Amino acid sequence: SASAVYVLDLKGKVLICRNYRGDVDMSEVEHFMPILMEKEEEGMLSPILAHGGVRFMWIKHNNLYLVATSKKNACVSLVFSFLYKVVQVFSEYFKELEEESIRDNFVIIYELLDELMDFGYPQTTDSKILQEYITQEAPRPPATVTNAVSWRSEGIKYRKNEVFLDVIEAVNLLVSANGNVLRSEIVGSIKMRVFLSGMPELRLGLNDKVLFDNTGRGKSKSVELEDVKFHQCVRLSRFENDRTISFIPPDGEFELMSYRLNTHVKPLIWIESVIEKHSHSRIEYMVKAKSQFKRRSTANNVEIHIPVPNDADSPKFKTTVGSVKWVPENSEIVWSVKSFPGGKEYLMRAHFGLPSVEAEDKEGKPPISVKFEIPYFTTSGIQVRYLKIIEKSGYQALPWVRYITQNGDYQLRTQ
Amino acid sequence: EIFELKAELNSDKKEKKKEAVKKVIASMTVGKDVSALFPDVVNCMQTDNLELKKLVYLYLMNYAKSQPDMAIMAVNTFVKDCEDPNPLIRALAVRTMGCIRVDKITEYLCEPLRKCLKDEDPYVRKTAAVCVAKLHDINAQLVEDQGFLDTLKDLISDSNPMVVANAVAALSEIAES
Amino acid sequence: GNIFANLFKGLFGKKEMRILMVGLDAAGKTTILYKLKLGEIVTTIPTIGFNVETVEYKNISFTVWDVGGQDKIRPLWRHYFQNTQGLIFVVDSNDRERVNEAREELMRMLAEDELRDAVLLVFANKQDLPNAMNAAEITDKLGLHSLRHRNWYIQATCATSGDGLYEGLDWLSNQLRNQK
Amino acid sequence: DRKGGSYSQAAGSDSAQS
Numbered sequence A: 001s002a003s004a005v006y007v008l009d010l011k012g013k014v015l016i017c018r019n020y021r022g023d024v025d026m027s028e029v030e031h032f033m034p035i036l037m038e039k040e041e042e043g044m045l046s047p048i049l050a051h052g053g054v055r056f057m058w059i060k061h062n063n064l065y066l067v068a069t070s071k072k073n074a075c076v077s078l079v080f081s082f083l084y085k086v087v088q089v090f091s092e093y094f095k096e097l098e099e100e101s102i103r104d105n106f107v108i109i110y111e112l113l114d115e116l117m118d119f120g121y122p123q124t125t126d127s128k129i130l131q132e133y134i135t136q137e138a139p140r141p142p143a144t145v146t147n148a149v150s151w152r153s154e155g156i157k158y159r160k161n162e163v164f165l166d167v168i169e170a171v172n173l174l175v176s177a178n179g180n181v182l183r184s185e186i187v188g189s190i191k192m193r194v195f196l197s198g199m200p201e202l203r204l205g206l207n208d209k210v211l212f213d214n215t216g217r218g219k220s221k222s223v224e225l226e227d228v229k230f231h232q233c234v235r236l237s238r239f240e241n242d243r244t245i246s247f248i249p250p251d252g253e254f255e256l257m258s259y260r261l262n263t264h265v266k267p268l269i270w271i272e273s274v275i276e277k278h279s280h281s282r283i284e285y286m287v288k289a290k291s292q293f294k295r296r297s298t299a300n301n302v303e304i305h306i307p308v309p310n311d312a313d314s315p316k317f318k319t320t321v322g323s324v325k326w327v328p329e330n331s332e333i334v335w336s337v338k339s340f341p342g343g344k345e346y347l348m349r350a351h352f353g354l355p356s357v358e359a360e361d362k363e364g365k366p367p368i369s370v371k372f373e374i375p376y377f378t379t380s381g382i383q384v385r386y387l388k389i390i391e392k393s394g395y396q397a398l399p400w401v402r403y404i405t406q407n408g409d410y411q412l413r414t415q
Numbered sequence B: 001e002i003f004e005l006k007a008e009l010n011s012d013k014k015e016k017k018k019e020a021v022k023k024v025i026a027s028m029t030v031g032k033d034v035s036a037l038f039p040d041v042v043n044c045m046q047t048d049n050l051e052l053k054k055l056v057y058l059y060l061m062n063y064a065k066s067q068p069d070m071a072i073m074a075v076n077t078f079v080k081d082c083e084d085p086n087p088l089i090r091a092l093a094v095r096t097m098g099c100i101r102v103d104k105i106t107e108y109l110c111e112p113l114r115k116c117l118k119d120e121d122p123y124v125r126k127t128a129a130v131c132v133a134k135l136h137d138i139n140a141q142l143v144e145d146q147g148f149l150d151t152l153k154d155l156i157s158d159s160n161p162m163v164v165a166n167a168v169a170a171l172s173e174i175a176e177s
Numbered sequence C: 001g002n003i004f005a006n007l008f009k010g011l012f013g014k015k016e017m018r019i020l021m022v023g024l025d026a027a028g029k030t031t032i033l034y035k036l037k038l039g040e041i042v043t044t045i046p047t048i049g050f051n052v053e054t055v056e057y058k059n060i061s062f063t064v065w066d067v068g069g070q071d072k073i074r075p076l077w078r079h080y081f082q083n084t085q086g087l088i089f090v091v092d093s094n095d096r097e098r099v100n101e102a103r104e105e106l107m108r109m110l111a112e113d114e115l116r117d118a119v120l121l122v123f124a125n126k127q128d129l130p131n132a133m134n135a136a137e138i139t140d141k142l143g144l145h146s147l148r149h150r151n152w153y154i155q156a157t158c159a160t161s162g163d164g165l166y167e168g169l170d171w172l173s174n175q176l177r178n179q180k
Numbered sequence D: 001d002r003k004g005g006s007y008s009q010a011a012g013s014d015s016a017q018s
């Protein structure tokens, strides 16, 4: 229940503001910057600010803080969801999120803000629906918003019915300094870019453990996602009733389902680091990377980031496979490898000097993270069974899907 | 500057009026007190272009509290726009009527609110519910006298499920206060 | 410079002209404007603000800005006085009590230096009952014959019937346009 | 070709489930 949502700037200037209830004065935005500065300097800065009896909830955007001032005890989660929807709509309409587009599309930006929410209650949240009624280059509102199906616009015609799916896998491993993995969770991502004619109702079917157990086929390799979230077009009733993933696919790229469950398998890449750091004399980087993934899968664009000393200079890299580049801005050395086949063993030996004068304050030990991304690999083993594409007119669809395995929160605690 | 903008707004050229409106909107967003030109834009308010109508409505909403006396020359325009065949125009008029913080403005908008309460368009119904909720928040006594509680309650048991949800949220907000 | 484009535009008609819609409330000003623009007797709510419309006749688009006779809208007629070339006063011959108020409003409107190039335009509204006066009694009561330096003409127009609107439009066009 | 795994055809439903 934010009183007014406004877009700020890096210098405190409000790029654009739009009051929705009028219960909060527009002059409260000026005091938001001093409050944020005081909070940052004291460690008490939070996204939800508080200016007396009015709370100024702000979200750190790409270039401006989306401050949504509120007065009463409005839904904080609702305000955050509205801000996220507004950010997504702006990203869809404008490819750049900065001051260049804030002051360049004000005529359409004001109309979009007015149409999105009224009296603090959001009304329009579909990017396609908003673009079909408000454009920067007006007819009556589309019937899709009024109709029940607000995620599948009717009347869409295409020459070919091709849908491109993406089995995105995020391998996150939380390995402590002792060598044991604490947080090892893999989050699935079933995103399909449906581009067909009409409003087909997708019938999602995969090798789900629950579905296999219900059907009596709980003996093969089935993916048991701890948390499964359906898309907006996905009908929750069918999933709760018999796990039937039946919903109208959206026009374009959208996230249908996103699995999320813990992983009990060995890490895809095993990286062991050795720190032979002398006392203000030199530093040793005994970094050894072992590929725990299958040899048939290659980790393309593998970049194992090893944090080097903050004051370290004149470093020498003695590795075997993969180029090592030291970035002064990042204050770390990334063991970048173009192609990392499974089972490969890469050994590196870093050596650099240190300044004679000791550092005044400590810099910490940031965890070492790798950027391995091996496509065409299904670590979870979940295989899609079928995709029920049904249309009233009747057409032969040719859906496609690709499985991509990447490294997410794969951070290894430093020694 | 100000004189040139006023002269452009007091002209019969649609391109010049649109340029003046865009300049006024840019000045207002940049931090320029354009409330002094609100009476000049009052005459150039009833325009066929929807882009200019939205800018005029936004200027009136942002310049309603600053110049409540000058806002009395927009009740007729709001009444005329409340019966526009285009659902977008009707929704914009309903939103602007509830967004104007005028004590004497909402009194004359009760009839348009009652007319738009039974709007067949789900977007029109949602806009009418939002306007009723805004009027109740601004004046609970006025909302009670207009008898919008019965209309809001019956909106829940109708079609336009998004409009039903908007009406339910409006009723909860009215009951919350 | 060359005026070939102006001559070409004037050969087929380029003049538009202007007009004003003022008078007391319930004097047929809104009805007169609707008849000029549309041509039918449509019932409308009182003009709280103002009505803007244009009528094309004789190749001239004489736009008329209707102004209500309400107390809160009577002082708002000064906003339309800027960039205005014509002024039409709506008389209420059937409202004897409001006749004095209408005459006072007309005198106040005509007593402004800004509204000097607009000739008087008095329409005998409510010309449907026997109580309505003629074209000379109304002018004599309003004192239009003593308004020097103003082209004021008394015309009787009935909103329900529509007769006399053409005569008033022709008189306004003659007062504004003085060409062949 | 495309990085991250080549696109593969998908079926319509579980043919072995009737």
Ligand SMILES: Nc1nc2c(ncn2[C@@H]2O[C@H](COP(=O)(O)OP(=O)(O)OP(=O)(O)O)[C@@H](O)[C@H]2O)c(=O)[nH]1
Pocket: C024, C025, C026, C027, C028, C029, C030, C031, C043, C044, C045, C046, C047, C048, C067, C068, C069, C070, C090, C125, C126, C127, C128, C158, C159, C160, C161
């Ligand atoms: N029925 C009828 N009404 C007439 C006639 N002549 C004048 N009128 C008046 O014309 C009025 C029409 O009202 P409006 O359309 O609002 O125009 P108006 O007279 O200027 O009134 P306002 O717009 O409120 O200032 C009626 O109220 C009548 O009082 C007539 O011949 N028949």
Ligand SMILES: [Mg+2]
Pocket: C029, C030, C031, C046, C047, C051, C066, C067, C068
């Ligand atoms: Mg009128």
